[PDB]
Enzyme design. Sequence first.
Site, mmCIF file in Angstrom:
data_model
loop_
_atom_site.group_PDB
_atom_site.id
_atom_site.type_symbol
_atom_site.label_atom_id
_atom_site.label_comp_id
_atom_site.label_asym_id
_atom_site.label_seq_id
_atom_site.Cartn_x
_atom_site.Cartn_y
_atom_site.Cartn_z
ATOM 1 N N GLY A 30 0.799 -1.207 0.000
ATOM 2 C CA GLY A 30 0.000 0.000 0.000
ATOM 3 C C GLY A 30 0.835 1.262 0.000
ATOM 4 O O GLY A 30 1.834 1.362 -0.717
ATOM 5 N N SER A 65 4.536 -5.621 -2.504
ATOM 6 C CA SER A 65 4.772 -4.179 -2.355
ATOM 7 C C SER A 65 5.406 -3.905 -0.990
ATOM 8 O O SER A 65 6.392 -4.564 -0.635
ATOM 9 C CB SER A 65 3.466 -3.448 -2.627
ATOM 10 O OG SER A 65 3.633 -2.049 -2.497
ATOM 11 N N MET A 66 4.900 -2.940 -0.219
ATOM 12 C CA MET A 66 5.369 -2.676 1.138
ATOM 13 C C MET A 66 5.246 -3.867 2.081
ATOM 14 O O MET A 66 5.950 -3.905 3.095
ATOM 15 C CB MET A 66 4.598 -1.493 1.729
ATOM 16 C CG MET A 66 4.990 -0.120 1.194
ATOM 17 S SD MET A 66 6.683 0.391 1.547
ATOM 18 C CE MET A 66 7.504 -0.135 0.048
ATOM 19 N N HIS A 115 8.365 -4.947 -6.402
ATOM 20 C CA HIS A 115 8.116 -4.115 -7.569
ATOM 21 C C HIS A 115 8.550 -2.684 -7.273
ATOM 22 O O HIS A 115 8.934 -2.346 -6.150
ATOM 23 C CB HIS A 115 6.645 -4.208 -8.009
ATOM 24 C CG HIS A 115 5.684 -3.481 -7.120
ATOM 25 N ND1 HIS A 115 4.342 -3.378 -7.415
ATOM 26 C CD2 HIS A 115 5.855 -2.850 -5.934
ATOM 27 C CE1 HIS A 115 3.733 -2.698 -6.461
ATOM 28 N NE2 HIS A 115 4.629 -2.364 -5.552
ATOM 29 N N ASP A 123 6.960 -6.606 -11.994
ATOM 30 C CA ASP A 123 6.485 -7.423 -10.884
ATOM 31 C C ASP A 123 7.243 -8.741 -10.831
ATOM 32 O O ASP A 123 6.989 -9.644 -11.633
ATOM 33 C CB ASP A 123 4.983 -7.681 -10.999
ATOM 34 C CG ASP A 123 4.164 -6.427 -10.813
ATOM 35 O OD1 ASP A 123 4.744 -5.324 -10.868
ATOM 36 O OD2 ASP A 123 2.938 -6.544 -10.608
#
Lengths: 190, 183, 184, 179, 182, 189, 182, 183, 190, 190, 182
Positions: free
Chosen positions: H59, H88-89, H113, H162
Amino acid sequence: IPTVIETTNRGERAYDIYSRLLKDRIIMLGSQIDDNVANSIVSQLLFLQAQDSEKDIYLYINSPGGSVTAGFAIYDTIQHIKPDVQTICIGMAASMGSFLLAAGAKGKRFALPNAEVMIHQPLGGAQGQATEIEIAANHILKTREKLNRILSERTGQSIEKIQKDTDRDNFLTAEEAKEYGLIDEVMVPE
Amino acid sequence: IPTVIRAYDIYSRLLKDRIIMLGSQIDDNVANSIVSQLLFLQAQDSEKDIYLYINSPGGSVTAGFAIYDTIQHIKPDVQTICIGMAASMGSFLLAAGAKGKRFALPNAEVMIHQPLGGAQGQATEIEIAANHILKTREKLNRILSERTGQSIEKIQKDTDRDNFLTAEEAKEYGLIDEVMVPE
Amino acid sequence: IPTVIERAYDIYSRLLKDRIIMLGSQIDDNVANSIVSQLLFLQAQDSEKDIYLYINSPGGSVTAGFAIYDTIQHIKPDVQTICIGMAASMGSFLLAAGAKGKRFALPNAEVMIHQPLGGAQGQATEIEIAANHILKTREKLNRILSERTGQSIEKIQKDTDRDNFLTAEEAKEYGLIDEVMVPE
Amino acid sequence: PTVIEDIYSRLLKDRIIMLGSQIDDNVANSIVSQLLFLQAQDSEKDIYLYINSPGGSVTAGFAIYDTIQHIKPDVQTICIGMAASMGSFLLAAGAKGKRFALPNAEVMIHQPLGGAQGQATEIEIAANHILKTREKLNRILSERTGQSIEKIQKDTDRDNFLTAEEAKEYGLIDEVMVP
Amino acid sequence: IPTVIAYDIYSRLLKDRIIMLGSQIDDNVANSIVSQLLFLQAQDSEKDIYLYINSPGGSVTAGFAIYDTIQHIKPDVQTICIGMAASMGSFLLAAGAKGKRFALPNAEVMIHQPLGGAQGQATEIEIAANHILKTREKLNRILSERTGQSIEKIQKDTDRDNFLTAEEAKEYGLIDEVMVPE
Amino acid sequence: IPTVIETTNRGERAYDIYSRLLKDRIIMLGSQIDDNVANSIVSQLLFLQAQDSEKDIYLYINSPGGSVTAGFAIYDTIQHIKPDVQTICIGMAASMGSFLLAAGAKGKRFALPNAEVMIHQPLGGAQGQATEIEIAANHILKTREKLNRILSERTGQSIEKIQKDTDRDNFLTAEEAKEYGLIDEVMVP
Amino acid sequence: IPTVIAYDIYSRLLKDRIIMLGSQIDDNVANSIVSQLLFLQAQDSEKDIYLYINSPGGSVTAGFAIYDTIQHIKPDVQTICIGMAASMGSFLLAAGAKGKRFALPNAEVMIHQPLGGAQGQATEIEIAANHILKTREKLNRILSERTGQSIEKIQKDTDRDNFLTAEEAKEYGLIDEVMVPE
Amino acid sequence: IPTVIEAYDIYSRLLKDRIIMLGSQIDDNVANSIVSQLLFLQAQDSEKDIYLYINSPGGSVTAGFAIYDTIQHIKPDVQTICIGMAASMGSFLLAAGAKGKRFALPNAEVMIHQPLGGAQGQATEIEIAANHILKTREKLNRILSERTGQSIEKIQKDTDRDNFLTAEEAKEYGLIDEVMVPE
Amino acid sequence: IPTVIETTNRGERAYDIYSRLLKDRIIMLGSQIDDNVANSIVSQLLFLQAQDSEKDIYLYINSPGGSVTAGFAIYDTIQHIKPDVQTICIGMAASMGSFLLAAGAKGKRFALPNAEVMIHQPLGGAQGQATEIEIAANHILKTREKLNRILSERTGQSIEKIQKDTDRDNFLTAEEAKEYGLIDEVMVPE
Amino acid sequence: IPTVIETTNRGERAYDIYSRLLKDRIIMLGSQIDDNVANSIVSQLLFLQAQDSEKDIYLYINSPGGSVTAGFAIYDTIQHIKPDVQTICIGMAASMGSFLLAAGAKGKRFALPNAEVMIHQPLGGAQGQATEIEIAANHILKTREKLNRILSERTGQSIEKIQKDTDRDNFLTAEEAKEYGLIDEVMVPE
Amino acid sequence: PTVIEAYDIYSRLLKDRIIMLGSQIDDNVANSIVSQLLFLQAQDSEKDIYLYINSPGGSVTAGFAIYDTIQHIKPDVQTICIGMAASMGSFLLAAGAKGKRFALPNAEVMIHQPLGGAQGQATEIEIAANHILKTREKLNRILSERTGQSIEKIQKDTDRDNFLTAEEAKEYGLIDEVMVPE
């Protein structure tokens, strides 16, 4: 909407199918009754009365009815013009359509054998203050009494009978409408 | 919606003092709540006065009559106090308080007008709706005439359009008995 | 909704402790489920104390109304019915369903009786099926109302054609209630 | 957050009232209920009304005004961020000598906002009512501030933004709180 | 939803081993009814449970979850029709213990074939149609076992919405008795 | 829609493709049947009778059907006019489209080899009071009796058979529609 | 959602080490189920856990979260299919302890390949396709481990939606026996 | 959310054991909640380890750095355990765990990513927004480089698209220290 | 759509580009196939067959396909008329467009070197009572059998092979469409 | 779009500005490329080859690209046709527009001074089952390979270089597009 | 409106060689403008052309299209600002022939840097930024050569919206004179 070409022995010309039918004095009442429709019908009935004040006009009726004031416009124009208008229910005459049917020349109101006639009391709406709802109710009740009385005149049924029979939606076959008096005969299939 | 510690909300704590707050449109759920509170306060003590505070834009006429009938049916007197606005069904509940015990604050407003409604469909159905809302107006004018002492003809004339009364004009009209002066 | 007390009720639960049932809403299966659960709980608590049903509803679902009717007829204790504001549609039917001598209206509540409302869609035989069902529903309603009121089925058939509004005194003369609650 | 022995219920024990939202009938009903409760608790200790409001309904603001004038305890008003016309009206309605703003608070005074739709008679009735509401507000402001009613009529014509020192010089507040 | 003391009305009725089915049968409703049934079996395995039904039915697999639960547990589940039992509601009405399936005199029952949709490539519409047809065969076979009516009669009679009175439902064998008022 | 410019002893005219086919006496029904389509098709049939009462008219059908009243308008216009109307299913004739297919002249109803015919009972609906729902149900049941009786006259099947065979969406191949009597012959190249 | 005294019905079931999985599987449902599994391991490392499954499945990485939690903890998890177990629901059904995968007689099972999507550039649609394919490989490999069916057979049978009865799911090796009612 | 009475929810009873469940997208409200839980668990005991169970798509990058900076500021070690996905995070917070105490479960997946952003309006604003997202990607690549031991260039190249990693590949990359073998 | 006018002889005739191509017996099918499109294509085929019963028609296909009954209408019309129809895939022939492509005259199916042909099974929906879903499934399965039979005749592949190949989307180049037998040759540029 | 009136010994005749440019064999590719636009362009190219088969056609490009199969229907410039199609970029040539720019005849591809060219890999998407996403990915990748092969043969850049350079959106000035070989000359301001 | 002579008003103005740019600059209007300018070049390669401008500007590539065509055709294009020339409208105003850029006395000319947008990955936003920055440099450079104003001054003044009167646009050099009424 298809175009028809016809020879005239003085030239050749293209018409819409409805405009060629209008040359035959056929008016098509094939949609709901609204302001635009009533303006068109009135203009067509007045043009045709201007062109020839003796020959009959042929109003073809296939509509769910519509606005009562516009139907009364077409009614008053039909009663004003000199030539007789012959009403032919082609498949469906409801509400003011069944009134514009019953509004044609005596002896000259027809239906195709499988056409539907619906008679029912007028629909409306009222909003706001109690006095505004009262005014709207009194107006729609005067409208219904005007319709019922014109129907009693043109149909020969008493106003009490038309009141009772229009309370709910009454669906008539062409034979039922002939026995009622909304039409004069059912067109025999040539 | 703050809490008073037992853990009341502020309205339940004011209900412990027999205070009822009207602060909303009157609908079946508001009227059902107010009726429930009135029946509860009758069961808690049938003598002590109820204090009903009104700041309402009006609402459903049958819900206001529900409250009116419950106020008239219970034994304890209901003191009505108008705080900010009392619009026609709020003004009708304001008038419905006990005689000598209907109050407004000096800057409160009252509005009286004829009921709103509507109708759709067949001429007979619009007739029935109009007849009903006219009889509802007659019933409202009759109850108002009894509560105010004004004549039905005067209320009929005054309610035709929205009539906005100050608290002094509402006392002159007899919708309230006193204006509450600040201490 | 205001709480009343560590025995913290809401106002309707405190009224339920006094055997008071508030029908202050549209009648759907959710409110019928709540009303029937209150009726069964109050029957369990005491089978001889009266129930007080307070009605202010536009009616609603016919099957939810019949659920409530069947529950109040089935349980042993008497259900007093008291019209508070409006008793329309099944609300008037539940008003008339109260115990005899125990159906009341406040001096200017109003009662409205009408034929049931429904709809149909799709094939002709499906529309026929829905019409047959809603006509049987109307016949069931008129039969029960004729027994609750003493009015003939022909009269209730005539009077429920359109929305028939009644005042409390007309509803008493119609036999939908037994008396009007004249205020102290 | 919940404090065991919510933050607004804990502050209410200290006779603190927070008006941190638009004034509507629900907010007015809540504030009036808190004022009647704090009167029933103690009829003589001061009440503190913290104001951070864009205003709202005029009749809902008059409900609060009339309640804070009706009750016996003095209601202190303390403006911390926003006081927009109905919020500045309630700011003016504090006890005399006990109306405060924090140094960076914003006060705005302006005339009522209004609509009318429909018949000419109904638009006339609504215009008359809004003009009489403006007169009522201007008169009450003239009494609370001490400004001329013609001065308030002129100054409230457009949205007027006053600093805390400007609101003190106008007389809407009596002090700016030094930190 | 009233409070009793700090139960709600349904939690208090749960102490009398009453279950209320007053809504559409969905996964969350099946999940709740199944959890209630398992809890009541744990509280007493030898004592009846009373299931009160007023629902339009709904999901067939949720109804089969409830059916399988009331068949797996030890106690007799009494079924009482309160207002409507339609679709899987009338299936769950029929699933109560024999001699313990009731309707009130003005309740009604509707039996009909299940409802389905299939948006597809032709093989996927075929797969959905074969599944919905096997689901109908399952329902009809169980209805036949519960009613004693033939699977052909149940097929013919569920072909359109068949509204039954409590008398007609007793004649059909969907209930054992009509519960006359006390 | 493309245009065709066509010469005579007097002329160039630029016809739309449907206006050129109408000059041949060919009417296309390639659409839902609504009141606008009914009025158009009826007006065309009247003009074709106007120009020559003796020559056959051709009605070419590719429709999901539609309104029963509009279709009975077309049906009654077909049965009124003197000239025989040939009806040709071009790809789909469902609902009133197959009813209008059966409306063609005896021996002059055709379908193409891969055309499909569907027959069903009419769709409608009702709302409001029990008396209103009853009146609507009565009306649509009389409309189904009308349709079934006319189809029995067109096809020679008994009313009970058409009643069963229209209870659900019944799809016919052109050869099945030939055996049912909804058409007389399948067109072969 | 009935109370029991001050638990809810699911929390009283959780006291008896009952987990209900009666919904679609998303991250919040996974996080709930994983937290319940961890708490049940924390209370007693030896007593069984009972997982009731009535699910359309859902998110694949949430299902693998549940799978890896039930495989990580020490206590055996009994899986009971009730109603429907589709998608990751039937995957979690097969993830139960051996000899402890059950279904109810009228429960039914669906197996099918994973569903996904991709957008944007050819390189991004490629990357997404490669990942959904590796996910299908992983799911087939785990199913082959837990059913003893061949990976080619599972690859063939999961191509379209495949609905299995409890008996067909037993023959497929997704469950060990049907819980027949006593 | 289910309840347990000793009256917790399941997450609050897991909080007694110092278990934090990150099962949702990382917005500021989630970061606020997780940072509050970290600060509370630091208050309760500063030596005992904390467990962070991660199943999230990631996010906001500023909420990720909020959590990362809290994990690094507090004294007790945070064990991070990838359960479902860490995209992600979420993969960044997975790598944020204590050295030797980043774990994945055997079938968990990691995705690394480059950060997403956006810009609108004037060329000068789009330039400022691009420069900020480029400095964000630099900061992320640097923290990943130090926590994984990969070079800036390798992470830059690998995060360009990705990159989905299995737990074994994430162990080779150095985002996790061990795959949790089943008991 | 640009107009073109300048012509030999009297040179009066202003055409849209499609009417100019229709003068050359070129029909364009560059859009989704629906009853409106199918009725247009059919009318153009009938007109061109009336104008000359011997000259080839040329049908240019760039369509994602569409309605199967509309496609069969086109198919049956091109099979009924006497003149051969040459089909040219200029860019895409998916689904029912690939079927109409294969429906060209033998030796007269063409594709441009970079056109793509996609064959698949028909798409369907069924909202239903279980007997209604059964009816819809049975109809879509008969429609697939009809399509597969026709393709098998036009293509020379066995119906089992077309059943296997249409189960998913199969994307064919013009070379692969030639190998399959959906087209007769790829138009080499010259 | 304004009308032009032109004078001739045959008469006085109206043209829209595009039909007047079509008289001069000028084709405006002034929009996103879809099947309807591609149909128009193909019909114009066919008509212009019909009227004169050895006279250059001018294709004027201001397009944000569009559909790849529509762009391939245009890609030939109907390379079937004998006439040499010149391509001029007016303001924008985005990937399918720059593909059609490169499709022009060698030595006859131009770009105005302040025109911009963009090349990138094709956009698309896939939804549904794993094998359906696989099918769509294999298709979009084979389409990219086809586009790269055509761009390689028309620019002389290696497929590896076009593969690298089309990965992200690559904006080229007219001079950069000439160095790349998408155009032959930048038009000098006359 | 129509003029019988049977032109519409804009076709009759085009007969004079008057082109109206009274609308948003999109690809469609840019194509119309270009087409018309090439027809007018065919009709007569020496007589001046008149471009009348009343536009809020628009697409920069559509404007650069109109620009590069105007500065290619042989005849002098006269540009008249009628009421508004903003962004690319002011650029096309300055694009007119030197000595033959005019404004009406109270028309307004607005010069500002181009708008854009960027989405997705950091490197996609970097590419969109780099492109909009090169577009701004191109615009600034052309305006520098067509006004005689330094690139630094145009960069500084076009940062925010700058509104010019006709007299200020004349002093800026965007127009050559203000048309006094005859």
